[PDB]
Design a protein around this motif. Structure first.
Motif, PDB file in Angstrom:
ATOM      1  N   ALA A 123      38.239  37.822  39.416  1.00 29.76           N
ATOM      2  CA  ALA A 123      39.002  36.709  40.295  1.00 29.76           C
ATOM      3  C   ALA A 123      39.770  35.793  39.393  1.00 29.76           C
ATOM      4  N   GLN A 126      42.614  37.322  37.739  1.00 30.83           N
ATOM      5  CA  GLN A 126      44.130  37.505  38.628  1.00 30.83           C
ATOM      6  C   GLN A 126      44.707  36.332  38.802  1.00 30.83           C
ATOM      7  N   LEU A 128      43.373  33.215  40.391  1.00 34.70           N
ATOM      8  CA  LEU A 128      43.213  32.471  41.697  1.00 34.70           C
ATOM      9  C   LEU A 128      42.623  31.157  41.374  1.00 34.70           C
ATOM     10  N   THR A 216      44.834  32.349  47.788  1.00 28.04           N
ATOM     11  CA  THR A 216      44.082  32.326  46.300  1.00 28.04           C
ATOM     12  C   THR A 216      42.872  31.219  46.272  1.00 28.04           C
ATOM     13  N   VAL A 218      38.698  32.654  47.527  1.00 27.25           N
ATOM     14  CA  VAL A 218      38.128  33.924  47.714  1.00 27.25           C
ATOM     15  C   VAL A 218      36.850  33.571  48.503  1.00 27.25           C
ATOM     16  N   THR A 305      36.969  43.422  43.974  1.00 25.44           N
ATOM     17  CA  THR A 305      37.640  42.398  43.897  1.00 25.44           C
ATOM     18  C   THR A 305      39.281  42.847  43.775  1.00 25.44           C
ATOM     19  N   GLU A 306      39.435  44.140  43.249  1.00 26.28           N
ATOM     20  CA  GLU A 306      40.849  44.428  43.003  1.00 26.28           C
ATOM     21  C   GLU A 306      41.156  45.111  44.242  1.00 26.28           C
ATOM     22  N   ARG A 308      40.796  43.792  47.188  1.00 21.36           N
ATOM     23  CA  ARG A 308      41.143  42.601  48.142  1.00 21.36           C
ATOM     24  C   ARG A 308      42.343  42.032  47.800  1.00 21.36           C
ATOM     25  N   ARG A 309      42.848  42.275  46.425  1.00 17.14           N
ATOM     26  CA  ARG A 309      44.056  41.471  46.173  1.00 17.14           C
ATOM     27  C   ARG A 309      45.315  42.514  46.479  1.00 17.14           C
ATOM     28  N   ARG A 310      45.099  43.728  46.450  1.00 20.04           N
ATOM     29  CA  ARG A 310      46.003  44.558  46.720  1.00 20.04           C
ATOM     30  C   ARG A 310      46.363  44.848  48.470  1.00 20.04           C
ATOM     31  N   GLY A 312      44.313  43.181  51.047  1.00 22.23           N
ATOM     32  CA  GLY A 312      44.414  41.934  51.834  1.00 22.23           C
ATOM     33  C   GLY A 312      43.309  42.273  53.171  1.00 22.23           C
TER      34      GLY A 312
END
Ligand SMILES: Cc1ncc(C[n+]2csc(CCOP(=O)(O)OP(=O)(O)O)c2C)c(N)n1
Ligand SMILES: Cc1ncc(C[n+]2csc(CCOP(=O)(O)OP(=O)(O)O)c2C)c(N)n1
Ligand SMILES: [Mg+2]
Ligand SMILES: [Mg+2]
Lengths: 777, 777
Positions: A123, A126, A128, A216, A218, A305-306, A308-310, A312
């Motif tokens: 995170a 990324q 955040l 941003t 988590v 975690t990757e 979730r960011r791609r 949502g």
């Protein structure tokens, strides 16, 4: 999964087949196909992803799982060993230096510490801003020392350490990223933190103000296996994930599956095959990982975690481990589960197993090998060393004119049109109703520059079709929010945000308590359809709203708006249970009120928002009185009257020396009693209203009674039964606070086990009997 | 689902391919393959079944769906038309002859009546005994007239018709089957009937006693779309389906999907694609059916009832319809949803559409066609025309000897062995503890011939490792239930059944209330881990247990066992909230008690089970006192003492003429106060215990105080804070019931907003201060 089921035999293993781009090849042998499928889907990571409906997000997961876990570097490997050493060192300190900590042990599940670290580090890379953690008792002090980063002195020095909250910073070993880490407060009631944590994250996202491309902060949420499958709050909170006022960009869920509850096994705990099967209802991926392979655990943390960011969406990790000791300090787990605890007793630890695996792959040199041994001794040695609330004439006219400034080619629906027209005329002529008084308050506060949020079932229109805060054009289906637009034109970045909830009370009220904690400077209000349905959020009232400041020193300014009145509509549409709220009050813990006039409701809401006192407000709001013309207010009541009134004396008394009876009352019943006084010409009675219930305004009640010096008796008159309403509280406390007062005499409905009758003719007969008893000589 | 996605073109439609037994053929053309797939999966019935894991149950559904709906006969067709005529005739009578019934209308969803009829008729042909229905308001009076079979006179003549229960018979038109039909009572709180209904079905199945091959009472449960996706009680209750004490052979679920809540649309109601997506979490099939094709609706009803009997699992039907009018009597639904209500307003009814379809397929003759017209006119014309509780010495010895009669080659675990040995000696020597007193009561009642059921979290072993009612052999994992075996040897068919619940309070307590209603002659008890966690079942306490008799005339004899005591273990492990239960009591609605002695607990449980008074019992049970040796009881207390005691006078008074103070107390605090009296030699104090709280035993308290004629003062002493415990109730009510009594003086902890402190040293200091205040001169 057997080749016999698909009509294939040993004689096909070295024959070649067309496979259509599997493993980036057109042709392949059956031997090679079986090897690859077993390496990808049958070792230390088990995946469920084929139920997902979108083709692009199914292909992303497929490509990553079939490429495999990347081979980690030596530096990476030694960093995983140092975290396991720290975890086990702290468990040993706790068990030896302190007593009754066996309940709270993490022994069996030490891989949790490197999993949480992997996710927080990913995170930070990324870019955040914060990670918010919610969890139960098991492993809490370990997470405080190894993940949040508190000193030992701070941990070991009201309520216990196992329930308070904390803050800290996480730097990145092999990068240039930083990130904040927060831990939320919670009670022993399992899973009650779920909605509260989500609300804290949404408040923090709203304050940063980065739009849809942002999100941003988590949320990381830890569960136990029995609680996750059993309690209904879990799936109720996941259902808020994609809704308009509630979306936070996804939640990373970790279920610690130690294959036991307390003395209860999974067979007698759930009717699902896995505990994480709610994921298939909501269309989300699940990763099952072995808690004795630490390299596989750090990979699953990164991949989740990757994802979730791609995309949502929510993601679920099942960590399969065991529980070494019993749940009690002195209790034998072999007493109930003897066969399971034959396998558990006398094993090697996950730290020991991983050290033996690294020193037997011959990567490490002589100098490097000595260091691995010395690290565990180092970690061990280290641990064991007069406020006015009126507005101006000009401010009032501007608020009225907002319902006229319609955007170009917008028309109102013709049943909403005449409501809008009266709002524009009323601010000069008169006749302001309850709903318009409430919106004039929230609007004034948004203009000054505050963030105002209102949420509940059917809250935009109103349950009783009274509010109309967002209007819709029947032709085009275009939305208009007049008071939000006026706020954003005054240049102090104020907002009025109004949302319709899902059909929930527990998850709904929990989310608004969370919002108040995650932004102290916001004005937040939760509304119930009827106050009778607030008993489905009793856990949140008892454990957070009424008790949070006393327990943990955590303050909130939440407003609860609960409808209330005895109007003949049955036992589940009459009482919000006043008696129950006054039972929970002590030493000014929360403010409780029932106002009679729209202007007084205005002045109460503004006093709460501009004071320094940081405690909740419970208002009992009307239903029929919403449209009573004797209740309406003049403009001078919002502009020349300065303060909120706690007691309102009788307007209609010719001579105070002639008064012999004094009636005390609170709410809608005033207007009925006042009608009868005028009809019968009673100049010997005076009716006095109590607008604030807790705290008891005893000085103002004393002043009122002093003004009638020939008063022989004092009656307390309420609509509710004799074991309900405000009478029980007032008969105990008021006589000791006003000694010279005469003995009070109750006039109410008879005591009963239900709230109200369900026959409408019986209601009308009871009401007649009540008012006759009051005026009887 | 497009042929382009699978690299096939129009040029492949008339080419032949190998299909592997699809449609019972080896070869087929692409044109024929597409025809069959579209006929099976894309017309008026949509199926979800491929997520099921068992191959045999996946193949059963596949074969039936791909064979298609059978062509119904003319007789069958006319019977479907007669049910639609009746449904629409009754809606017209309700709207015209009575007012404020627009809320409760079924207009838009009239196909519900032929769906429910199809399922009940299929069950009658299978040979089953009863169908139990639970549902909300919408369509309730229609179901009472057309499915249960009540007369019009009975319907149209406390609480309303929309909440009471009913019974009736269903004969089978084209067969020789009969079946009972029952409708359950419920409150306005949505989905609270779900666990209560399941419990009623299990009690009825247990009374018939037909074994595992039985399960001959069918639960049929109706939901609305918004409530099903939103409230957490729904999935919490489905999780009990396959567990040991809770399995009823499957539940048929009908979700009425009218695409709207109140003023809320599906976009703002759920984060799932369909409302019925919880089915994919539990591994069950879903059928989606169009509510304007009545022949398809009657087929889905039949197929669902056949799937339940074969596989014994849950099944979900989604009926897609609409809502013609608004939810309020005078409210416009176009105000909020204008685009949806353009499509709805001015449609033809489902009855009209089906009549037009039959008269235009030319099957019907001239005489037959006239009859179809005349049927609707016929239906319209019709509608518009001194109990002793001791046991014998011999009975007591036999109960003791049950823990010795171990089966051949069974040994006890060595921490359970010495508990068993003391149970066998105690019934002659003395020293009987709390847990053994409770089991001696339930055992005695099972011998007489009753069905005794005990359920809760970790209830077989006990939370405090105190009960041991089922024992397990560490070598073999074989179970033994001593008291069940003794009951089945006495030849009156008695049973002692003990079950471990899932981690739930709402669903758990709801299920045991249901069991009490569905078998009046059973003894049922629900236990909580700690009494502090019972606030998560507040809906069931408020709406069913405390209020059911007053509302609907429905009686229950449920026992709630709630642990309670201030022992220094924090705010979520100290109070069961006595004050809250005494607030809900009026005119003997339920009995509330806190006993001090194991023998008195025995006598209370037996009085409740052998009386004619049909009301609940709430007992506040101990934690530390479970193992206190001053609390233990002698055998003469179960054999020579005849009745339960409500007040217990002081055992240790030499001379009654010397007493000057009298202390009243309830629970574990007695033993602390008694210790101090002996140490200090106070012959001027007398300590009196109140064992029953509601009703107030005022005659016995008066007799006690009369026995001390030189008493100057009376103290009321409790451990709980001054706004909690029994003091608020007793300071209001006791002085008016005993006029000559002196003024009471409280001695308790200070009033506060939480239950108890979380620091253990503060607890010990408070307790010292409390006892010093009591004895202070
Ligand atoms: C709402 C609620 N119900 C019940 C309990 C009682 N309780 C405390 S611990 C526990 C067992 C939880 O087991 P699990 O979730 O599997 O996790 P573990 O502690 O074994 O890691 C229970 C039922 C509680 N604290 N809160
Ligand atoms: C526990 C609870 N929460 C909220 C309500 C308020 N309420 C009454 S009717 C209603 C709408 C229910 O809509 P739905 O379930 O979709 O069914 P419909 O009435 O449209 O058929 C709501 C929220 C309630 N009665 N009970
Ligand atoms: Mg567990
Ligand atoms: Mg609906």
């Amino acid at each position: 999964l057997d080749i016999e089921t698909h009509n294939l035999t040993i004689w096909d293993l070295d024959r070649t087949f067309n496979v259509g781009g599997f493993g980036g090849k057109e042709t392949m042998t059956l031997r090679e196909v079986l090897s690859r499928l077993r390496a990808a889907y049958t070792l230390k990571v088990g995946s469920e992803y084929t139920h997902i409906l979108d083709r692009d997000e199914r292909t992303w997961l497929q490509d990553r799982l079939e490429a495999g876990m990347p081979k980690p570097t030596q530096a990476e490997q030694k960093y995983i060993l140092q975290k396991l050493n720290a975890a086990e060192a702290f468990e040993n300190f706790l068990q030896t230096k302190y007593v009754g900590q066996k309940r709270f042990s993490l022994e069996g599940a030490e891989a949790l510490i490197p999993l949480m670290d992997s996710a927080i580090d990913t995170a930070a890379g990324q870019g955040l801003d914060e990670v918010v953690i919610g969890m139960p008792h098991r492993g809490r002090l370990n997470v405080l020392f190894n993940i949040v980063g508190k000193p030992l002195a701070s941990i070991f020095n009201g309520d216990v350490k196992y329930h308070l909250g904390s803050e800290g910073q996480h730097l990145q070993m092999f990068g240039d990223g930083e990130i904040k880490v927060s831990l939320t407060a919670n009670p022993s009631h399992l899973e009650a933190v779920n909605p509260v944590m989500e609300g804290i994250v949404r408040a923090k996202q709203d304050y940063l103000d980065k739009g849809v491309d942002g999100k941003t902060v988590v949320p990381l949420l830890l569960h136990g296996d029995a609680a996750f499958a059993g309690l209904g709050i879990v799936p109720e909170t996941i259902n808020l994930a994609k809704l308009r006022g509630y979306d936070v960009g996804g939640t990373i869920h970790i279920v610690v599956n130690n294959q036991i509850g307390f003395t209860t096994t999974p067979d007698s705990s759930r009717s699902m095959h896995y505990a994480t099967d709610y994921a298939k209802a909501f269309g989300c991926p699940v990763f099952h990982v072995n808690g004795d392979d630490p390299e596989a655990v750090v990979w699953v943390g990164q991949l989740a975690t990757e994802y979730r960011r791609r995309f949502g969406k929510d993601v679920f990790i099942d960590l399969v481990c065991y529980r070494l000791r019993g749940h009690n300090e002195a209790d034998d787990p072999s007493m109930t589960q003897p066969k399971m605890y034959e396998l558990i007793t006398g094993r090697e630890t996950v730290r020991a197993q991983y050290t033996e695996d690294l020193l037997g792959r011959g990567d490490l040199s002589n100098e490097d090998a000595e260091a691995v041994v010395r690290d565990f001794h180092d970690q061990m040695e280290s641990v064991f060393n007069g406020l006015e609330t009126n507005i101006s004439r000009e401010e009032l006219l501007e608020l009225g004119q907002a319902f006229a400034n319609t955007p170009e080619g917008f028309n109102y629906h013709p049943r909403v049109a005449p409501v809008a027209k009266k709002r524009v005329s009323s601010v000069t002529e008169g006749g302001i109703d309850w709903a318009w008084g409430e919106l004039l308050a929230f609007g004034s506060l948004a203009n000054s520059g505050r963030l105002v949020r209102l949420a509940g079932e059917d809250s935009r229109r109103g349950t009783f079709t009274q509010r109309h805060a967002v209007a819709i054009d029947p032709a085009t289906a275009e939305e208009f929010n007049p008071l939000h637009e006026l706020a954003q034109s005054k240049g102090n970045n104020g907002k009025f945000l109004v949302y319709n909830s899902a059909l929930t009370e527990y998850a709904g009220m929990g989310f608004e308590y969370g919002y108040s904690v995650g932004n102290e400077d916001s004005i937040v209000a939760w509304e119930a359809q009827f106050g009778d349905f607030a008993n489905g959020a009793q856990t949140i009232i008892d454990e957070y709203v009424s008790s949070g400041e006393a327990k943990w020193g955590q303050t909130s300014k939440l407003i609860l708006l609960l409808p209330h009145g005895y109007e003949g509509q049955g036992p589940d549409h009459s009482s919000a249970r006043i008696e129950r709220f006054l039972q929970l009050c002590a030493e000014g813990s929360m403010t409780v009120a029932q106002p009679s006039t729209p202007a007084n409701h205005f002045h109460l809401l503004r006093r709460h928002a501009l004071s320094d006192l940081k405690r909740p407000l419970v208002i009992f709001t009307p239903k029929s009185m919403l449209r009573n013309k004797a209740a309406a207010s003049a403009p001078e009541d919002f502009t020349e009257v300065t303060k909120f009134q706690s007691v309102i004396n009788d307007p209609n008394v010719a001579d105070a020396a002639k008064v012999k009876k004094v009636m005390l009352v609170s709410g809608k019943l005033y207007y009925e009693l006042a009608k009868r006084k005028e009809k019968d010409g009673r100049d010997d009675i005076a009716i006095v209203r109590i607008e604030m219930l807790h705290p008891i305004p005893f000085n103002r009640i004393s002043e009122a009674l002093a003004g009638y010096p020939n008063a022989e008796e004092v009656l307390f008159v309420q609509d509710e039964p004799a074991n309900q309403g405000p009478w029980p509280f007032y008969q105990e406390h008021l006589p000791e606070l006003i000694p010279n007062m005469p003995k009070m005499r109750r006039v109410s409905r008879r005591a009963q086990s239900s709230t109200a009758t369900g026959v409408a003719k019986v209601h009308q007969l009871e009401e007649k009997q009540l008012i006759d008893e009051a005026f009887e000589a």
